Amino acid sequence: KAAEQYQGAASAVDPAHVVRTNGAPDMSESEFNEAKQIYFQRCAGCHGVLRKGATGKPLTPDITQQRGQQYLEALITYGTPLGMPNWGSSGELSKEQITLMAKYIQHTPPQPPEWGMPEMRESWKVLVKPEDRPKKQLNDLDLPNLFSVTLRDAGQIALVDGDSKKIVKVIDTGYAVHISRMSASGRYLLVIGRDARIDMIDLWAKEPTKVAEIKIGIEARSVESSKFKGYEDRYTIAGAYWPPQFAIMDGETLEPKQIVSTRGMTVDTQTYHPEPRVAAIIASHEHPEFIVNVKETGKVLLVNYKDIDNLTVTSIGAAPFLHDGGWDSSHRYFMTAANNSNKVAVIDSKDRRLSALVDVGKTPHPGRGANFVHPKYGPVWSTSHLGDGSISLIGTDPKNHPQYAWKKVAELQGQGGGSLFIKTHPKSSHLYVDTTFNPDARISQSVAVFDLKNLDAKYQVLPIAEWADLGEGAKRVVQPEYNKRGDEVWFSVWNGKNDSSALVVVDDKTLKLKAVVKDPRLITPTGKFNVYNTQHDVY
Amino acid sequence: AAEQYQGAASAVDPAHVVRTNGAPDMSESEFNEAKQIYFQRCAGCHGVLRKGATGKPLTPDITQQRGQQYLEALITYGTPLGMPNWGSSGELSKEQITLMAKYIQHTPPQPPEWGMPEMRESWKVLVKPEDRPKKQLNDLDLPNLFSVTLRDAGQIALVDGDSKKIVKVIDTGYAVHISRMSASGRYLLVIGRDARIDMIDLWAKEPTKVAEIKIGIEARSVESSKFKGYEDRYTIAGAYWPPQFAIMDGETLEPKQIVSTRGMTVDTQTYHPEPRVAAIIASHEHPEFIVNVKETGKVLLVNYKDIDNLTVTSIGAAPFLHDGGWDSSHRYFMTAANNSNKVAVIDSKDRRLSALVDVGKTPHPGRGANFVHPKYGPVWSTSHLGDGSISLIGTDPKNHPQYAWKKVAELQGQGGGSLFIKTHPKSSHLYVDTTFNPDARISQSVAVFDLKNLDAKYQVLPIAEWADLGEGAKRVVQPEYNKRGDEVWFSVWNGKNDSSALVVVDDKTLKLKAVVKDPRLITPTGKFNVYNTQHDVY
Ligand code: DHE
Ligand code: DHE
Ligand code: HEC
Ligand code: HEC
Ligand SMILES: [Cl-]
Ligand SMILES: [Cl-]
Ligand SMILES: [O-]
Ligand SMILES: [O-]
């Protein structure tokens, strides 16, 4: 009873300021559930699970009830010129469904489940123990020139032989794999589904097979491996959208070791955000650390894994809505884009500080980017945009080019907006830019190609989808990617699940069609990752 | 383009996203009546989101599982595991108990957040640093000054150590929990349970405030940078609500950084929506702050070398971290994980957990008591709330490795309900209070041990009786020495409508030396001698 009286006094919290949430329009289970289904299918991607993920005012009951039914129905029906699509005018949703959505967002957001160590360990599986694995490569494949291609809707990936242009093996994975990464030893391929399911693949088995799997959350986009000298295959890390966390696992068995929450304060307003989704992750070559991007809070965390028992993290403020990015030519400065902020943040992995914030076009989407030496400006890194058809060129040589370092030194103009990936190679004199989400069929079905030796000349349009000879469907082209020797560039013709897709290969030296990869198993091909170029960050 | 880019369905499955309810309907006045009682009688232990106590959380998934009649029965009769009985004791009525059972079956109401906009708004620079004196403009003996908390009055009193008189009374936040000194010895920092901080300049004609700010809705700790070359550089504070800690300018109190403590636990490694910040201590080995995170049982090493890009080292200890203090060398932080019945040892130099020592039932050391044992060498001691034991733990890995981080021995006090143990380098006595012991006489007195003869039983000093105050519980709490170390002060914490006092004992003779009475001395609690606090002399 002593300790009971010790903790007996009243809380300093004032009961009058603790608020009960409600005042929302009544809706039955049937109604609420119908709206909820539409929300996660059509609205969650942008607005998040807790509805504070998009720009502008959140869809939380404090704001939505302020607006009212009529305002909400009207906004959902016609959308806004600032990124909010129209659901009524387009005919996507009915007025009955819209009335339900307006009522739905006036209620407290329903909570998805958490995903802690117990859930992770339960999902963890060692298919083949390290001891039972081969001591050397048991097949005669040219592993470095292998391509890990995502068979999105089929929940698989396919290993495609670079030179033979044929599928060597199809592997079952998590749903709609987002990216594929290579371990520092060049032996293990890591893939992560958008459902947060990771699969570890041993390229040395007679037939490349999975040796381990685990689920790190409910939804995720990124996975990465330790690339600092002396740590080959030591640790694997992955970022989840939900729950807002990232986990570190054993690089050899995928055993969950540490789980860290990213819920916290924003860089701009320094206010609390309950859903800071983890975006791009890149491994540092300067220190034994992982560079993790936190979207909504706009924070870049340097997670040191020299000692994972007592985790040391350095939090660098950048800019809101961090997404994708990649190394500069020297592999020291992490060029990442804060797309909704229309800026590119530059992270010095050596000094461990924000080198700069560069103003670019509308919604930068570099991917990993494209590096090359500009005649006039020296070493640069480039990115295309979703919001416009411009290409930003940024100086990345502070040491020998201080006049151009971290400055949007110049621009280029591609076919138009809706661009996703820009690309080049050290041995190439070409710069490729796609237009996957451009509203025009012809533009979305082709790629622009610039001449690095003559940047003043207009790009040449390569009819990628046309060359595929596939028939009907949107046939959107996406992410250009080089081979080991980078004497040929690959593209994906992302056609419908019930349509016909293909991989188109172009001779980089001549800009001529070289091969077209077709197979009934090649369903909804999206991302493609050459083993060598991915492992050694060649872009 | 961007609308089609971010247009695919979320991987989150709608069928697993749950809408909450199935709770017993209650009107606004019924809900508010129950809510008021919750924060007044239950929040302390269970927390705002009701996941703060041991055992099962009071969240709707568990409470609705238990049912209305199970909940009423438990609230009425309590349990022998830390849950008080509210019906049997007659504290709450059956109508109120029914309202509470219904209340906990509903989603926990949410108090507001408190970020940078709220902090800068509460921020006030009363006297700019350039307008502050360049020298001590008074004749006071600052180092032997005592900062006494006048809890219920929302003030503190500066009492002159040698003269025994109140030098000044200052208006502060409600119920200040602790006083702390800047490394320069010039500034006094106080923080109320309401999270309001006040910076006082002891060099002014009259010791007055020069700045203040609110860093939350509820807090308990505040600290100053004590690493060499960082004198009055930064000031940190931990809050209960929201679960965060903030770093400010050690000269103006200007909010700089705010970090959330919400995260995974050390044991189950699961998410905890309310890990509250406890004790905080400034490292002397590295320019960093050592912060304790209760519920998640984590000890963070917040480096302020570069306040723009904060680097934090998270060290897992044990759940329910609370208070603690340095060993004799000021290298190892001895903190208690009360509900786990353990004391964690954090090596601030090597920056790792040196060990987990098993002690008594609910250890409550405060800052602890360091002294050299005749046999086991240098030790660090603590008393308990759960029992009458006193643990002695070896703290010398270099010259006494065989006793390092071990419960080397045990002493026995008057009983449970103990809050603080104390000693001094110049003293040969060890004092331990028993503030919350259910027996009036035991709670109104303290035990004193002879460090030159630990085998001998303690002596009992009638502190409250010596005060001659009349009626009231007259609970005695927290012994504290003067800079010299020949005087030991005690607070006689009586009701606000009763008479309280500070009793001072001659440590050399164990005889009454003085009694401080004043109509302004209302509900005196914590007393902090300037020198001993500033230099961690304990
Ligand atoms: C955070 C993130 C990364 C960086 C990972 C890294 O390198 O660590 C990334 C990279 C990528 C990369 C990396 C390419 C590279 O060369 O590095 C690819 C191929 C890719 C295919 C797609 N992405 Fe991606 N992508 C998201 C998130 C991300 N995508 C989304 O949340 C978004 C906007 C909506 C969604 O539904 O997921 C989205 C849409 C897409 C697509 O439309 C693509 C083409 C197909 C799909 O399945 O969604 N994302
Ligand atoms: C986190 C924490 C510390 C360590 C701070 C540091 O070192 O930086 C501390 C220290 C302290 C210290 C430090 C003493 C020292 O010598 O270091 C004092 C005087 C003190 C007086 C009280 N404490 Fe305290 N105290 C709490 C929390 C804490 N108390 C509670 O939450 C609790 C259990 C319940 C409550 O109602 O606050 C509680 C009850 C009490 C009391 O009942 C006291 C006697 C009076 C009061 O106002 O609550 N606490
Ligand atoms: C700390 C001194 C407490 C105060 C004040 C209150 N509660 Fe508590 N409660 C506490 C503990 C340590 C425990 C677990 C005890 C055990 O035997 O497991 C509890 C438990 C409860 C429960 C039951 C939980 C369950 O098993 O389903 C209830 C319903 C409960 N407490 C309610 C509650 C209320 C409403 C209180 C204020 C009027 C209250 N508790 C105060 C510790 C403490
Ligand atoms: C991204 C491609 C979006 C999708 C898909 C949906 N919304 Fe959206 N929404 C988005 C943005 C960028 C904004 C801000 C627009 C602005 O001009 O400020 C919004 C805003 C809304 C609002 C209004 C909020 C307010 O100002 O009070 C509502 C009510 C809203 N969005 C609802 C909503 C629903 C129900 C959706 C799916 C059926 C949905 N949005 C999709 C971005 C995007
Ligand atoms: Cl934070
Ligand atoms: Cl965490
Ligand atoms: O992407
Ligand atoms: O305390």
The DSSP secondary structure of B289-357, one letter per residue, reads EEEEETTTTEEEEEE-TTSSS-EEEEEE--SS---EEE-TTS-EEEEEEGGGTEEEEEETTTTEEEEEE
- Alpha carbons B244 and B253: distance in angstroms, whole number: 17
Question: What phi and psi values does residue A104 have, to the nearest 5 degrees?
Answer: -60, -50
Structure tokens at B300: 């963070």
Nearest to B44 among A7, A45, A437 (CB): A7
- Classify B291 in phi/psi space as left (phi over 0), alpha (psi -120 to 50) or beta: beta
Chain B residues close to A21, C-beta within 8 Å: 107, 109-110
∠ Cα B77 B83 B87 (to 5°): 30
Across B262-286, b (16+ Cβ under 10 Å) vs e yields: bbbbbeebebbbbbbbbbbbbbbeb
Q: How far is A49 from chain B (nearest CA, A)?
A: 8
Could you say which of A43, A182, A200, A249 is catalytic? Answer: A43
A125 residue type, one letter: K
Question: Is A418 within 8 Å of A385 (Cβ atoms)?
Answer: no
Six-digit token pair at B256?
């700089």
When scoring B10, B91, B341, B383 by the number of chain A Cβ atoms within 10 A, the one with the most, hence best to mutate, is B10
Within 6 A (CB) of ligand 4 lie: A 38, 42-43, 45-47, 54-57, 59, 63, 67, 72, 75-76, 80, 82-85, 87, 101; B 3, 6-7
**Ligand-binding site membership of B147 (annotated):** no
Where b means 16+ CB within 10 Å and e means fewer, A243-273 reads bbbbbbbbbbbbebbbbbbbbbbbbeebebb
Distance CA B201, CA B184 (A): 11
Geometric angle at alpha carbon B524, from B522 and B525, rounded to 5°: 150
| Angle A21-A25-A28 from CA coordinates, rounded to 5° | 105
Other beta carbons less than 10 A from residue B398's beta carbon:
9
The partner residues of B236 in beta bridges, in order of sequence, read B223, B247
What is d(CA B342, CA A506) in angstroms, rounded to the nearest whole number? 67
Cα–Cα distances in angstroms (integers) from residue B191 to residues A501, B353, B526, in the given order? 66, 29, 12
User: What is the C-alpha to C-alpha distance for residues A254 and B125, in angstroms, rounded to an integer?
Assistant: 53
Within an 8 Å CB–CB cutoff, is residue A153 touching chain B? no
* Residue B512 β-bridge partners: B505
Q: Which residue carries 């003869």 as its tokens?
A: B453
Cβ of B343 less than 6 Å from ligand 3: no
> What is the spatial distance between Cα A430 and Cα A440, in angstroms, rounded to a whole number?
24
Q: Is B199 helix (H, G, I), strand (E, B) or coil?
A: strand
Is B41 within 8 Å of A8 when comparing Cβ atoms? yes
CB-based burial label for B229 (10 Å; 0-12, 13-18, 19+): exposed
Q: Do B362 and A12 touch (CB under 8 A)?
A: no
Chain A, residues 476-505, CB within 8 A of chain B, namely none
C-alpha–C-alpha distance, residues A179 and A221, integer Å: 7
Q: Which residues of A are annotated as a binding site?
A: 43, 46-47, 67, 80, 84, 178, 221-222, 241, 368, 479
- How close B208 gets to chain A, by Cα (Å)? 25
Q: Which domains does chain B have, with CATH numbers?
A: 1-111 (1.10.760.10), 112-538 (2.140.10.20)
d(CA B492, CA B475): 6
Q: Are A473 and A496 in contact (CB under 8 A)?
A: yes
For ligand 1, which residues put their CB under 6 angstroms from it? A 45, 152, 176, 178-179, 194, 221-222, 279-281, 323-324, 367-368, 478-479, 526-527; B 5-6, 8
- Asked if A110 and B17 come within 8 Å (Cβ–Cβ), the reply is yes
Structure tokens at A322: 């961090």
Closest chain B residue to the Cα of A416, Cα to Cα: B1
Rounded to 10 degrees, the C-alpha dihedral A341/A344/A349/A351 comes to -90
A341 phi/psi in degrees, rounded to 5: -100, -5
| Nearest atom in ligand 4 to B5's CA | 2
Relative to the CA of B6, which ligand 4 atom is closest?
A: 2
| Annotated catalytic residue, options A101, A120, A249, A323 | A323
Whole-number Å distance between alpha carbons of A45 and A357: 26
* Residues of chain A with C-beta less than 8 angstroms from the C-beta of B310: 314-315
Determine what percent of chain B falls in helix, strand and coil, rounding each to the nearest 5.
15, 35, 45
This PDB structure is determined at a resolution in Å of 2.2
Taking every pair of C-alpha atoms in chain B, what is the biggest distance, in angstroms? 85
Looking at this protein, which amino acid is placed at residue A76? I
Tokens coding A132: 């039972």
Q: Read out DSSP for A472-521? A: SS--EEEEEEE-SS-SEEEEEEE--TTS--EEEEEETTTTEEEEEE--TT
Half-sphere exposure of A526 (CA within 13 A, CB side): 20
For residues A329 and A455, give the distance between their C-alpha atoms in angstroms, rounded to a whole number.
19
Nearest to B309 among A111, A309, A316 (CB): A316
Residue A389, chain B, CB below 8 Å: the answer is no
Spacing of C-alpha A408 from chain mean position: 24
Rounded Cα distance between B326 and B281, Å, is 9
Distance CA A312, CA A304 (A): 6
Query: Is the bond into A439 cis (omega within 30 degrees of 0)?
Result: no
B74 close to ligand 3 (CB < 6 Angstrom)? yes
Q: Is B66 annotated for ligand binding?
A: yes
Determine if residue B269 is labeled as part of a ligand binding site. no
Give nearest CA residue, ligand 3 atom 27. B56
Q: Tell me if A314 sits within 8 A of A352, measured CB to CB.
A: yes
Q: What is the dihedral of CA A467, A470, A472, A473, to 10 degrees?
A: -80
Report how far apart, in Å, the C-alpha atoms of B471 and of each of A2, B18, B437, B500 are: 21, 55, 18, 10
Going from the C-alpha of A342 to that of each of A58, A369, A448, B170, the distances in angstroms are 20, 15, 22, 51
CA B437, B441, B445, B449 torsion: positive or negative? negative
A43 is catalytic: yes
CA distances from A304 to A307, A308, A327, B507 (A): 7, 7, 18, 51
End-to-end CA distance of chain A: 67
Bond from prior residue into B207 cis (ω within 30 degrees of 0): no
B132: which strand partners?
Answer: none
What value, to the nearest 5°, has the Cα angle with vertex A64 and ends A59 and A69? 125
- Which residues are in the CB-under-5-Å shell of ion ligand 6? A 260-261; B 263-264
From the CA of B79, give the closest atom in ligand 3. Answer: 17
Q: Give the active site residue among A27, A84, A285, A287.
A: A84
Q: Give the separation between CA A486 and CA A427, rounded to whole angstroms.
A: 7
Query: Which residues lie below 8 Å from residue B444, measured CB to CB, with a gap of 6+?
Result: B462, B463, B464, B465, B474, B475, B476, B492
Residue A300: other Cβ atoms inside 10 A: 28
Contacts of A305 (CB under 8 A, 6+ apart): A226, A231, A234, A235, A237, A248, A288, A289, A290
- Residue A524's closest CA among A495, A491, A504, A481? A495
Residues 6+ apart with CB under 8 A from A74: none
CB contact under 8 A, B436 and A2: yes
**Residue located nearest, by CA, to atom 1 of ligand 4:** A46
Bridge partners of B260, per DSSP, are B244
What's the per-residue H, E or C state across A192-237? ECCCCEEEEEECCCCCCEEEEEEECCCEEEEEEECCCCCCCCCEEE
Q: Quick check: helix, strand or coil at residue B274?
A: coil
Tokens of B93: 């009525």
Tokens of A387: 């919001």
Q: From the DSSP assignment, how many helices (H) and strands (E) are in chain B?
A: 10, 35
d(CA A327, CA A334): 5
B42 is known to lie in a ligand binding site: yes
Choose, out of A6, A13, A114, the residue to mutate when testing the contact with B (most B CBs < 10 Å): A13
Experimental method: X-ray
| Closest approach of B408 to chain A, Cα-based (Å) | 25
CA distance linking residue B519 with residue B141, whole number of Å? 24
What is the three-state SS of A65-127? HHHCHHHHHHHHHHCECCCECCCCCCCCCCHHHHHHHHHHCCCCCCECCCCCHHHHHHHCEEC
Q: State the SS3 of B427-450.
A: CCEEEECCCCCCCHHHHCCEEEEE
Task: Tell me the backbone φ, ψ of residue A22, rounded to 5 degrees.
Answer: 175, -165
Tell me the C-alpha distance between A309 and A534, whole Å: 29
Distance of CA A463 from the midpoint of ligand 7 (Å): 23
Could you please report the per-residue DSSP string of A398-466? TTT-TTTBTSEEEEEE-S-S----EE--TT--EEEE--TT-SSHHHHT-EEEEETT-TTSPPEEE-HHH
Question: Is B308 in the A-facing interface, judged by CB distances under 8 Å?
Answer: yes
Give the C-alpha distances (Å, rounded to integers) separating A294 from A352, B15, B302, B330.
Answer: 16, 27, 20, 37
What is the length of chain B?
A: 538
Whether B56 lines ligand 3, by a CB cut-off of 6 Å, is: yes
Total residue count of chain A as it appears in this document: 539
| 3-state secondary structure at position B121 | helix
Decide if B179 contacts B147 (C-beta within 8 A).
yes
Retrieve residue B321's tokens: 């971290």
The answer to whether B276 is a known ligand-binding residue is no
**Residue written as tokens 């490349």?**
A208
Nearest to A281 by CA among A195, A179, A199, A176: A179
Torsions phi, psi for A101 (to 5 deg): -65, -40
Considering only CA atoms, which of B475, B383, B291 is closest in space to residue A8? Answer: B475
Q: Is B220 annotated as a binding residue?
A: yes
d(CA A468, CA B256): 57
Distance CA A281, CA A291 (A): 6
Give the minimum alpha-carbon distance from A33 to chain B in angstroms, rounded to a whole number: 8
Rounded to 5°, the CA angle A100-A104-A110 comes to: 140
Pairing state of beta strands A502-507 and B176-181? Answer: unpaired
Match 């690309």 to its residue by tokens: A423
| B491 touches ligand 2 (CB under 6 Å) | no
Residue pair B256/B307 in contact (Cβ under 8 Å)? The answer is yes
Q: Do B296 and B275 form a contact (C-beta atoms < 8 A)?
A: yes
Per the structure block, which two tokens stand in for A522?
């090649």
Closest residue in A to B33 (Cα) is A15
* Interchain contact, B5 vs A386, CB within 8 Å: yes
Which residue from B259, B209, B210, B256 is spatially nearest to B234, judged by alpha carbons?
Answer: B256
Cβ atoms of A421 and A384 within 8 Å: the answer is yes
Q: Which residue from B58, B83, B95 has its CB within 8 A of the most atoms of ligand 3, so it is best to mutate?
A: B83
In one letter, which amino acid is A525?
P
CA distance B294 to B135: 41
3-state secondary structure string across B363-392:
ECCCCCEEEEECCCEEEEEEEECCCCEEEE
Nearest in space to A291 (alpha carbons), one of A255, A315, A271: A315
Q: In whole angstroms, give the CA distance from residue B86 to residue A10.
A: 15
Structure-token match 């005889």, residue found: B511
| Contacts A–B by Cβ distance under 8 A | 259
What CA–CA distances, in Å, run from A90 to A77, A96, A437? 8, 15, 18
* Residue B322 Cα: closest atom of ligand 2: 1
